Amino acid sequence: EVETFAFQAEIAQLMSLIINTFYSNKEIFLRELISNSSDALDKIRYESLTDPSKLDSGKELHINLIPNKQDRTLTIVDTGIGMTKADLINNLGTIAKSGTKAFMEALQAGADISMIGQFGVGFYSAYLVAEKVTVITKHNDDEQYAWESSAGGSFTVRTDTGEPMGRGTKVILHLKEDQTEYLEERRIKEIVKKHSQFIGYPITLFVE
Amino acid sequence: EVETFAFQAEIAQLMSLIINTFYSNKEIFLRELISNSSDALDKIRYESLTDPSKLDSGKELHINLIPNKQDRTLTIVDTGIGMTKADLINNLGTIAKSGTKAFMEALQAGADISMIGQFGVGFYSAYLVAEKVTVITKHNDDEQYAWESSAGGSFTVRTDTGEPMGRGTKVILHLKEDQTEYLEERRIKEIVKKHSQFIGYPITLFVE
Ligand SMILES: O=S(=O)(Nc1ccc(O)c(-c2c(O)ccc3ccccc23)c1)c1cccs1
Numbered sequence: 001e002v003e004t005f006a007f008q009a010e011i012a013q014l015m016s017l018i019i020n021t022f023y024s025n026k027e028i029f030l031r032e033l034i035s036n037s038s039d040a041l042d043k044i045r046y047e048s049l050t051d052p053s054k055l056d057s058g059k060e061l062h063i064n065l066i067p068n069k070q071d072r073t074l075t076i077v078d079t080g081i082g083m084t085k086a087d088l089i090n091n092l093g094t095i096a097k098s099g100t101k102a103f104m105e106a107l108q109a110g111a112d113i114s115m116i117g118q119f120g121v122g123f124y125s126a127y128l129v130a131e132k133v134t135v136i137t138k139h140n141d142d143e144q145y146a147w148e149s150s151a152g153g154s155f156t157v158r159t160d161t162g163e164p165m166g167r168g169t170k171v172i173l174h175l176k177e178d179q180t181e182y183l184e185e186r187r188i189k190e191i192v193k194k195h196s197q198f199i200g201y202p203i204t205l206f207v208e
Numbered sequence: 209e210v211e212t213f214a215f216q217a218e219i220a221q222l223m224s225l226i227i228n229t230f231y232s233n234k235e236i237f238l239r240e241l242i243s244n245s246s247d248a249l250d251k252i253r254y255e256s257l258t259d260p261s262k263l264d265s266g267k268e269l270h271i272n273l274i275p276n277k278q279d280r281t282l283t284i285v286d287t288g289i290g291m292t293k294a295d296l297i298n299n300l301g302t303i304a305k306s307g308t309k310a311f312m313e314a315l316q317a318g319a320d321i322s323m324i325g326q327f328g329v330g331f332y333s334a335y336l337v338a339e340k341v342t343v344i345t346k347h348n349d350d351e352q353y354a355w356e357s358s359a360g361g362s363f364t365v366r367t368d369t370g371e372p373m374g375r376g377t378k379v380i381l382h383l384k385e386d387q388t389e390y391l392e393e394r395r396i397k398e399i400v401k402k403h404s405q406f407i408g409y410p411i412t413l414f415v416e
Protein backbone atom coordinates (compact mmCIF):
# COMPACT_ATOMS: atom_id res chain seq x y z
CA GLU A 1 0.00 0.00 0.00
CA VAL A 2 2.88 2.41 0.84
CA GLU A 3 5.98 2.26 -1.36
CA THR A 4 9.23 3.75 0.03
CA PHE A 5 12.00 4.86 -2.39
CA ALA A 6 15.53 6.20 -1.98
CA PHE A 7 16.25 9.62 -3.42
CA GLN A 8 19.02 9.58 -5.98
CA ALA A 9 22.21 10.54 -4.24
CA GLU A 10 22.51 13.98 -5.87
CA ILE A 11 18.91 14.85 -4.95
CA ALA A 12 19.59 13.90 -1.35
CA GLN A 13 22.72 16.14 -1.41
CA LEU A 14 20.60 18.99 -2.84
CA MET A 15 17.98 18.49 -0.10
CA SER A 16 20.68 18.50 2.54
CA LEU A 17 22.33 21.57 1.22
CA ILE A 18 18.96 23.35 1.20
CA ILE A 19 18.19 22.22 4.81
CA ASN A 20 21.63 22.97 6.23
CA THR A 21 23.00 26.09 4.42
CA PHE A 22 22.63 29.29 6.37
CA TYR A 23 20.50 31.43 4.02
CA SER A 24 17.86 34.00 5.11
CA ASN A 25 15.84 34.77 1.97
CA LYS A 26 13.65 31.64 2.37
CA GLU A 27 10.59 33.34 1.01
CA ILE A 28 11.59 32.34 -2.54
CA PHE A 29 10.07 28.83 -2.04
CA LEU A 30 6.59 30.24 -2.97
CA ARG A 31 7.73 31.77 -6.24
CA GLU A 32 9.28 28.41 -7.23
CA LEU A 33 6.12 26.42 -6.34
CA ILE A 34 3.80 28.86 -8.06
CA SER A 35 5.96 28.97 -11.16
CA ASN A 36 5.74 25.16 -11.24
CA SER A 37 1.94 25.37 -11.00
CA SER A 38 1.93 27.92 -13.88
CA ASP A 39 4.04 25.52 -16.03
CA ALA A 40 1.58 22.65 -15.30
CA LEU A 41 -1.26 24.92 -16.20
CA ASP A 42 0.50 26.02 -19.42
CA LYS A 43 0.65 22.35 -20.32
CA ILE A 44 -2.96 21.35 -19.91
CA ARG A 45 -4.05 24.53 -21.70
CA TYR A 46 -1.76 23.62 -24.61
CA GLU A 47 -3.24 20.13 -24.87
CA SER A 48 -6.73 21.47 -24.71
CA LEU A 49 -6.11 23.67 -27.71
CA THR A 50 -6.43 20.63 -29.94
CA ASP A 51 -8.50 18.36 -27.65
CA PRO A 52 -11.11 19.96 -25.40
CA SER A 53 -12.03 16.67 -23.70
CA LYS A 54 -8.68 17.16 -21.87
CA LEU A 55 -10.62 19.63 -19.72
CA ASP A 56 -13.45 17.16 -18.91
CA SER A 57 -11.73 16.80 -15.49
CA GLY A 58 -12.08 20.49 -14.82
CA LYS A 59 -12.29 23.61 -16.95
CA GLU A 60 -10.88 26.21 -14.57
CA LEU A 61 -7.13 26.84 -14.59
CA HIS A 62 -6.13 28.57 -11.38
CA ILE A 63 -3.86 28.57 -8.37
CA ASN A 64 -5.11 28.49 -4.76
CA LEU A 65 -2.98 29.32 -1.69
CA ILE A 66 -4.49 27.98 1.49
CA PRO A 67 -2.98 28.68 4.94
CA ASN A 68 -4.12 26.65 7.93
CA LYS A 69 -2.60 27.94 11.19
CA GLN A 70 -4.06 24.98 13.15
CA ASP A 71 -2.42 22.21 11.06
CA ARG A 72 0.52 24.50 10.46
CA THR A 73 0.33 23.89 6.75
CA LEU A 74 0.51 26.06 3.67
CA THR A 75 -1.24 24.48 0.63
CA ILE A 76 -0.66 25.43 -3.02
CA VAL A 77 -3.34 23.90 -5.36
CA ASP A 78 -3.32 24.12 -9.06
CA THR A 79 -5.52 22.53 -11.66
CA GLY A 80 -2.66 22.05 -14.08
CA ILE A 81 -1.89 18.87 -15.97
CA GLY A 82 -0.83 16.89 -12.84
CA MET A 83 1.55 13.98 -12.70
CA THR A 84 1.43 10.26 -13.33
CA LYS A 85 2.93 7.88 -10.78
CA ALA A 86 5.90 7.44 -13.05
CA ASP A 87 6.41 11.26 -13.09
CA LEU A 88 6.33 11.46 -9.31
CA ILE A 89 8.91 8.75 -8.86
CA ASN A 90 11.17 10.42 -11.52
CA ASN A 91 11.77 13.48 -9.32
CA LEU A 92 8.33 14.97 -9.92
CA GLY A 93 8.53 15.19 -13.77
CA THR A 94 11.91 16.99 -13.71
CA ILE A 95 15.45 16.21 -14.91
CA ALA A 96 16.53 16.71 -11.29
CA LYS A 97 19.74 14.73 -11.40
CA SER A 98 21.37 16.94 -14.04
CA GLY A 99 19.66 20.10 -12.73
CA THR A 100 21.29 19.46 -9.35
CA LYS A 101 24.71 18.99 -10.93
CA ALA A 102 24.46 22.38 -12.67
CA PHE A 103 23.01 24.11 -9.55
CA MET A 104 25.69 22.87 -7.17
CA GLU A 105 28.37 23.92 -9.66
CA ALA A 106 26.88 27.35 -10.02
CA LEU A 107 26.82 27.71 -6.19
CA GLN A 108 30.55 26.88 -5.77
CA ALA A 109 31.26 29.70 -8.27
CA GLY A 110 29.25 32.82 -7.18
CA ALA A 111 25.45 31.89 -7.31
CA ASP A 112 23.05 31.77 -4.34
CA ILE A 113 20.09 29.57 -3.42
CA SER A 114 17.59 32.01 -4.94
CA MET A 115 18.64 30.94 -8.44
CA ILE A 116 17.44 27.31 -7.91
CA GLY A 117 14.56 27.77 -10.42
CA GLN A 118 16.99 28.47 -13.30
CA PHE A 119 18.33 24.86 -12.92
CA GLY A 120 14.86 23.27 -13.05
CA VAL A 121 14.88 22.13 -9.37
CA GLY A 122 12.81 24.85 -7.68
CA PHE A 123 10.54 22.34 -5.98
CA TYR A 124 13.21 21.39 -3.43
CA SER A 125 13.26 24.99 -2.08
CA ALA A 126 10.03 23.97 -0.16
CA TYR A 127 12.55 22.49 2.32
CA LEU A 128 13.67 25.99 3.29
CA VAL A 129 10.42 26.18 5.21
CA ALA A 130 8.81 22.74 5.52
CA GLU A 131 9.82 19.87 7.70
CA LYS A 132 7.72 17.58 5.48
CA VAL A 133 6.06 18.17 2.05
CA THR A 134 3.19 16.10 0.69
CA VAL A 135 2.38 16.33 -3.04
CA ILE A 136 -1.05 15.11 -4.03
CA THR A 137 -1.63 14.85 -7.76
CA LYS A 138 -3.99 13.69 -10.44
CA HIS A 139 -3.23 13.40 -14.18
CA ASN A 140 -5.94 12.60 -16.78
CA ASP A 141 -4.10 9.34 -17.72
CA ASP A 142 -3.64 7.96 -14.14
CA GLU A 143 -5.20 7.70 -10.66
CA GLN A 144 -4.70 10.07 -7.74
CA TYR A 145 -1.37 9.59 -5.85
CA ALA A 146 0.30 11.09 -2.85
CA TRP A 147 4.11 11.58 -2.65
CA GLU A 148 5.63 12.43 0.71
CA SER A 149 9.08 13.16 2.21
CA SER A 150 10.62 14.56 5.30
CA ALA A 151 13.97 14.31 3.43
CA GLY A 152 16.42 12.03 5.18
CA GLY A 153 17.04 10.30 1.89
CA SER A 154 13.68 8.58 1.23
CA PHE A 155 10.19 9.49 -0.11
CA THR A 156 6.96 7.51 -0.17
CA VAL A 157 4.28 7.01 -2.81
CA ARG A 158 0.72 5.74 -2.13
CA THR A 159 -2.52 5.86 -4.07
CA ASP A 160 -4.50 8.64 -2.41
CA THR A 161 -7.89 8.02 -0.70
CA GLY A 162 -8.35 11.69 0.33
CA GLU A 163 -10.62 14.18 -1.39
CA PRO A 164 -10.76 13.69 -5.19
CA MET A 165 -9.15 16.54 -7.04
CA GLY A 166 -10.31 16.13 -10.68
CA ARG A 167 -6.91 17.13 -12.15
CA GLY A 168 -3.89 18.98 -10.78
CA THR A 169 -1.44 19.02 -7.93
CA LYS A 170 -1.67 20.09 -4.29
CA VAL A 171 1.60 20.76 -2.52
CA ILE A 172 1.11 20.62 1.29
CA LEU A 173 3.86 22.26 3.26
CA HIS A 174 4.09 21.15 6.91
CA LEU A 175 6.01 24.21 8.10
CA LYS A 176 9.02 24.26 10.46
CA GLU A 177 7.82 25.76 13.77
CA ASP A 178 9.87 28.91 13.25
CA GLN A 179 8.47 29.51 9.76
CA THR A 180 4.83 30.33 10.51
CA GLU A 181 5.08 33.82 9.07
CA TYR A 182 4.19 32.15 5.70
CA LEU A 183 0.74 31.42 7.16
CA GLU A 184 0.07 35.18 7.70
CA GLU A 185 -2.09 36.92 5.08
CA ARG A 186 0.14 39.97 5.17
CA ARG A 187 3.34 38.12 4.33
CA ILE A 188 1.91 35.80 1.65
CA LYS A 189 0.52 38.80 -0.29
CA GLU A 190 3.78 40.68 0.07
CA ILE A 191 5.57 37.67 -1.44
CA VAL A 192 3.15 37.02 -4.30
CA LYS A 193 3.05 40.69 -5.36
CA LYS A 194 6.89 40.90 -5.24
CA HIS A 195 7.70 37.62 -7.05
CA SER A 196 4.69 36.35 -8.95
CA GLN A 197 3.13 39.49 -10.45
CA PHE A 198 3.27 38.10 -14.03
CA ILE A 199 1.80 34.68 -13.56
CA GLY A 200 -0.96 34.17 -16.19
CA TYR A 201 -3.54 32.51 -13.94
CA PRO A 202 -5.72 33.82 -11.12
CA ILE A 203 -4.18 33.25 -7.69
CA THR A 204 -6.61 33.22 -4.87
CA LEU A 205 -5.41 33.53 -1.33
CA PHE A 206 -7.83 31.67 0.99
CA VAL A 207 -8.61 33.42 4.27
CA GLU A 208 -9.24 31.55 7.58
CA GLU B 209 3.07 21.22 -51.35
CA VAL B 210 3.18 24.64 -49.60
CA GLU B 211 0.41 25.44 -47.11
CA THR B 212 -0.19 29.12 -46.22
CA PHE B 213 -1.93 30.00 -42.91
CA ALA B 214 -3.11 33.23 -41.29
CA PHE B 215 -1.61 34.12 -37.93
CA GLN B 216 -4.21 34.50 -35.23
CA ALA B 217 -5.03 38.15 -34.92
CA GLU B 218 -3.31 38.65 -31.54
CA ILE B 219 -0.11 36.99 -32.81
CA ALA B 220 -0.09 39.31 -35.81
CA GLN B 221 -0.53 42.30 -33.43
CA LEU B 222 2.38 40.99 -31.31
CA MET B 223 4.55 40.63 -34.43
CA SER B 224 3.66 44.13 -35.51
CA LEU B 225 4.35 45.63 -32.17
CA ILE B 226 7.75 43.90 -32.12
CA ILE B 227 8.58 45.13 -35.68
CA ASN B 228 7.35 48.69 -35.20
CA THR B 229 8.11 49.71 -31.55
CA PHE B 230 11.20 51.81 -31.15
CA TYR B 231 13.33 49.68 -28.79
CA SER B 232 17.17 49.43 -28.85
CA ASN B 233 18.01 46.39 -26.71
CA LYS B 234 17.34 43.94 -29.60
CA GLU B 235 20.07 41.58 -28.52
CA ILE B 236 17.61 39.76 -26.23
CA PHE B 237 16.27 37.69 -29.20
CA LEU B 238 19.20 35.21 -28.76
CA ARG B 239 18.53 34.59 -25.08
CA GLU B 240 14.86 33.83 -25.91
CA LEU B 241 15.76 31.42 -28.76
CA ILE B 242 18.42 29.64 -26.74
CA SER B 243 16.15 29.32 -23.75
CA ASN B 244 13.59 27.71 -26.06
CA SER B 245 16.24 25.26 -27.30
CA SER B 246 17.13 24.44 -23.64
CA ASP B 247 13.43 23.74 -22.88
CA ALA B 248 13.21 21.39 -25.93
CA LEU B 249 16.34 19.68 -24.77
CA ASP B 250 14.98 19.38 -21.20
CA LYS B 251 12.03 17.57 -22.73
CA ILE B 252 13.76 14.91 -24.77
CA ARG B 253 16.13 14.24 -21.87
CA TYR B 254 13.12 13.74 -19.58
CA GLU B 255 11.53 11.26 -21.98
CA SER B 256 14.75 9.39 -22.36
CA LEU B 257 14.96 8.82 -18.64
CA THR B 258 12.33 6.12 -18.96
CA ASP B 259 12.77 5.21 -22.66
CA PRO B 260 16.27 5.34 -24.14
CA SER B 261 15.08 4.51 -27.67
CA LYS B 262 13.85 8.15 -27.66
CA LEU B 263 17.50 9.01 -28.34
CA ASP B 264 17.82 6.60 -31.32
CA SER B 265 17.53 9.76 -33.50
CA GLY B 266 20.56 11.28 -31.85
CA LYS B 267 22.22 10.98 -28.47
CA GLU B 268 23.90 14.39 -28.18
CA LEU B 269 21.94 17.24 -26.62
CA HIS B 270 23.52 20.54 -27.60
CA ILE B 271 23.01 23.96 -29.09
CA ASN B 272 24.88 25.24 -32.16
CA LEU B 273 25.06 28.91 -33.23
CA ILE B 274 26.07 29.29 -36.84
CA PRO B 275 26.68 32.71 -38.47
CA ASN B 276 26.92 32.97 -42.23
CA LYS B 277 27.87 36.50 -43.36
CA GLN B 278 27.33 35.57 -47.05
CA ASP B 279 23.68 34.43 -46.69
CA ARG B 280 23.23 36.98 -43.94
CA THR B 281 21.76 34.37 -41.66
CA LEU B 282 22.21 33.43 -38.04
CA THR B 283 21.27 29.76 -37.33
CA ILE B 284 20.43 28.30 -33.90
CA VAL B 285 20.33 24.43 -33.96
CA ASP B 286 19.33 22.28 -31.12
CA THR B 287 18.80 18.56 -30.88
CA GLY B 288 15.87 18.93 -28.50
CA ILE B 289 12.56 17.15 -28.81
CA GLY B 290 11.47 19.07 -31.97
CA MET B 291 7.94 19.75 -33.10
CA THR B 292 5.20 17.91 -34.94
CA LYS B 293 3.37 19.64 -37.78
CA ALA B 294 0.46 20.18 -35.46
CA ASP B 295 2.80 21.92 -32.95
CA LEU B 296 4.17 24.24 -35.62
CA ILE B 297 0.77 25.34 -36.78
CA ASN B 298 -0.34 25.92 -33.12
CA ASN B 299 2.12 28.81 -32.68
CA LEU B 300 5.18 26.57 -32.41
CA GLY B 301 4.00 24.46 -29.41
CA THR B 302 3.13 27.53 -27.30
CA ILE B 303 -0.06 29.00 -25.79
CA ALA B 304 0.73 32.15 -27.79
CA LYS B 305 -2.74 33.61 -27.92
CA SER B 306 -3.05 33.97 -24.13
CA GLY B 307 0.67 34.73 -23.71
CA THR B 308 0.24 37.69 -26.05
CA LYS B 309 -2.77 38.97 -24.12
CA ALA B 310 -0.77 38.98 -20.87
CA PHE B 311 2.34 40.49 -22.55
CA MET B 312 0.51 43.37 -24.20
CA GLU B 313 -1.24 44.13 -20.91
CA ALA B 314 2.01 44.13 -19.03
CA LEU B 315 3.49 46.55 -21.62
CA GLN B 316 0.66 49.12 -21.27
CA ALA B 317 1.41 49.14 -17.51
CA GLY B 318 5.23 49.54 -17.04
CA ALA B 319 6.96 46.45 -18.69
CA ASP B 320 9.34 46.52 -21.68
CA ILE B 321 9.96 44.18 -24.62
CA SER B 322 12.80 42.40 -22.81
CA MET B 323 10.28 40.62 -20.57
CA ILE B 324 8.67 38.76 -23.54
CA GLY B 325 10.05 35.38 -22.32
CA GLN B 326 8.08 35.59 -19.03
CA PHE B 327 4.81 35.43 -21.09
CA GLY B 328 5.87 32.33 -23.05
CA VAL B 329 6.20 34.16 -26.42
CA GLY B 330 9.97 34.74 -26.65
CA PHE B 331 10.18 33.24 -30.12
CA TYR B 332 8.60 36.32 -31.73
CA SER B 333 11.53 38.50 -30.51
CA ALA B 334 13.47 37.02 -33.54
CA TYR B 335 11.59 39.75 -35.46
CA LEU B 336 13.64 42.43 -33.69
CA VAL B 337 16.45 41.38 -36.00
CA ALA B 338 15.16 39.16 -38.81
CA GLU B 339 13.17 40.14 -41.84
CA LYS B 340 12.21 36.47 -42.26
CA VAL B 341 12.61 33.43 -39.92
CA THR B 342 12.57 29.82 -41.08
CA VAL B 343 12.08 27.08 -38.47
CA ILE B 344 13.11 23.60 -39.56
CA THR B 345 12.13 20.84 -37.17
CA LYS B 346 11.98 17.12 -36.66
CA HIS B 347 10.13 15.27 -33.86
CA ASN B 348 10.48 11.49 -33.30
CA ASP B 349 6.71 11.02 -34.02
CA ASP B 350 6.57 13.01 -37.32
CA GLU B 351 8.47 13.93 -40.52
CA GLN B 352 10.73 16.93 -41.05
CA TYR B 353 8.86 20.24 -41.68
CA ALA B 354 9.79 23.79 -42.44
CA TRP B 355 7.75 26.77 -41.10
CA GLU B 356 8.43 30.20 -42.56
CA SER B 357 7.21 33.80 -42.14
CA SER B 358 8.18 37.28 -43.07
CA ALA B 359 5.28 38.41 -40.81
CA GLY B 360 2.66 40.36 -42.70
CA GLY B 361 0.02 38.16 -41.16
CA SER B 362 0.75 34.75 -42.76
CA PHE B 363 3.19 31.83 -42.33
CA THR B 364 3.85 28.79 -44.50
CA VAL B 365 4.39 25.12 -43.71
CA ARG B 366 5.98 22.55 -46.08
CA THR B 367 7.53 19.14 -45.61
CA ASP B 368 11.27 19.78 -45.75
CA THR B 369 13.53 18.20 -48.43
CA GLY B 370 16.73 19.86 -47.10
CA GLU B 371 19.39 18.14 -45.03
CA PRO B 372 17.94 15.55 -42.61
CA MET B 373 18.34 16.61 -39.02
CA GLY B 374 17.66 13.43 -36.97
CA ARG B 375 15.73 15.30 -34.22
CA GLY B 376 15.53 18.94 -33.17
CA THR B 377 14.89 22.41 -34.46
CA LYS B 378 16.92 24.85 -36.54
CA VAL B 379 15.85 28.47 -36.40
CA ILE B 380 17.27 30.39 -39.42
CA LEU B 381 17.28 34.12 -39.00
CA HIS B 382 17.48 36.10 -42.27
CA LEU B 383 18.78 39.31 -40.68
CA LYS B 384 17.63 42.87 -41.44
CA GLU B 385 20.49 44.59 -43.31
CA ASP B 386 21.23 46.88 -40.38
CA GLN B 387 21.46 43.99 -37.91
CA THR B 388 24.59 42.20 -39.09
CA GLU B 389 26.43 42.78 -35.84
CA TYR B 390 24.79 39.49 -34.67
CA LEU B 391 26.92 37.68 -37.26
CA GLU B 392 30.17 38.93 -35.57
CA GLU B 393 31.95 36.46 -33.28
CA ARG B 394 32.70 39.21 -30.80
CA ARG B 395 29.10 40.27 -30.31
CA ILE B 396 27.54 36.77 -30.21
CA LYS B 397 29.93 35.72 -27.41
CA GLU B 398 29.28 38.93 -25.51
CA ILE B 399 25.55 38.16 -25.67
CA VAL B 400 25.74 34.48 -24.74
CA LYS B 401 28.06 35.12 -21.75
CA LYS B 402 25.79 37.97 -20.52
CA HIS B 403 22.41 36.23 -20.93
CA SER B 404 22.85 32.49 -21.26
CA GLN B 405 25.58 31.64 -18.74
CA PHE B 406 23.39 29.05 -16.93
CA ILE B 407 22.08 27.04 -19.82
CA GLY B 408 22.66 23.31 -19.06
CA TYR B 409 23.84 22.26 -22.52
CA PRO B 410 27.03 22.91 -24.47
CA ILE B 411 26.72 25.88 -26.84
CA THR B 412 29.13 25.87 -29.67
CA LEU B 413 29.69 28.98 -31.69
CA PHE B 414 30.64 28.00 -35.28
CA VAL B 415 33.40 30.09 -36.85
CA GLU B 416 33.53 30.97 -40.60
O1 LIG C 1 7.38 20.52 -16.76
S1 LIG C 1 6.82 20.11 -15.43
O2 LIG C 1 6.81 18.61 -15.31
N1 LIG C 1 5.33 20.73 -15.19
C1 LIG C 1 4.54 20.22 -14.25
C2 LIG C 1 3.57 19.28 -14.58
C3 LIG C 1 2.75 18.75 -13.60
C4 LIG C 1 2.89 19.16 -12.28
O3 LIG C 1 2.08 18.64 -11.31
C5 LIG C 1 3.85 20.10 -11.94
C6 LIG C 1 3.99 20.51 -10.62
C7 LIG C 1 2.99 21.27 -10.02
O4 LIG C 1 1.88 21.60 -10.72
C8 LIG C 1 3.14 21.68 -8.70
C9 LIG C 1 4.28 21.33 -7.98
C10 LIG C 1 5.27 20.58 -8.58
C11 LIG C 1 6.41 20.23 -7.86
C12 LIG C 1 7.41 19.48 -8.47
C13 LIG C 1 7.27 19.07 -9.79
C14 LIG C 1 6.13 19.41 -10.51
C15 LIG C 1 5.13 20.17 -9.90
C16 LIG C 1 4.68 20.63 -12.93
C17 LIG C 1 7.79 20.80 -14.14
C18 LIG C 1 8.29 20.13 -13.10
C19 LIG C 1 9.01 20.89 -12.24
C20 LIG C 1 9.11 22.20 -12.56
S2 LIG C 1 8.24 22.40 -14.00
Ligand SMILES: O=S(=O)(Nc1ccc(O)c(-c2c(O)ccc3ccccc23)c1)c1cccs1
Nearest residue numbers: 244245247248288289290291300301302331377
Ligand atom coordinates in the same frame (compact mmCIF):
# COMPACT_ATOMS: atom_id res chain seq x y z
O1 LIG D 1 7.55 23.79 -24.34
S1 LIG D 1 8.04 24.06 -25.74
O2 LIG D 1 7.02 23.57 -26.74
N1 LIG D 1 9.50 23.39 -26.00
C1 LIG D 1 9.94 23.22 -27.25
C2 LIG D 1 9.79 21.99 -27.87
C3 LIG D 1 10.25 21.81 -29.17
C4 LIG D 1 10.86 22.86 -29.84
O3 LIG D 1 11.31 22.69 -31.12
C5 LIG D 1 11.01 24.09 -29.22
C6 LIG D 1 11.63 25.14 -29.89
C7 LIG D 1 12.98 25.09 -30.18
O4 LIG D 1 13.71 24.00 -29.81
C8 LIG D 1 13.59 26.14 -30.85
C9 LIG D 1 12.85 27.25 -31.23
C10 LIG D 1 11.49 27.31 -30.94
C11 LIG D 1 10.74 28.42 -31.31
C12 LIG D 1 9.39 28.48 -31.02
C13 LIG D 1 8.78 27.42 -30.35
C14 LIG D 1 9.52 26.31 -29.97
C15 LIG D 1 10.88 26.25 -30.26
C16 LIG D 1 10.55 24.27 -27.92
C17 LIG D 1 8.30 25.78 -25.96
C18 LIG D 1 7.83 26.52 -26.97
C19 LIG D 1 8.18 27.83 -26.90
C20 LIG D 1 8.94 28.18 -25.85
S2 LIG D 1 9.18 26.77 -24.94
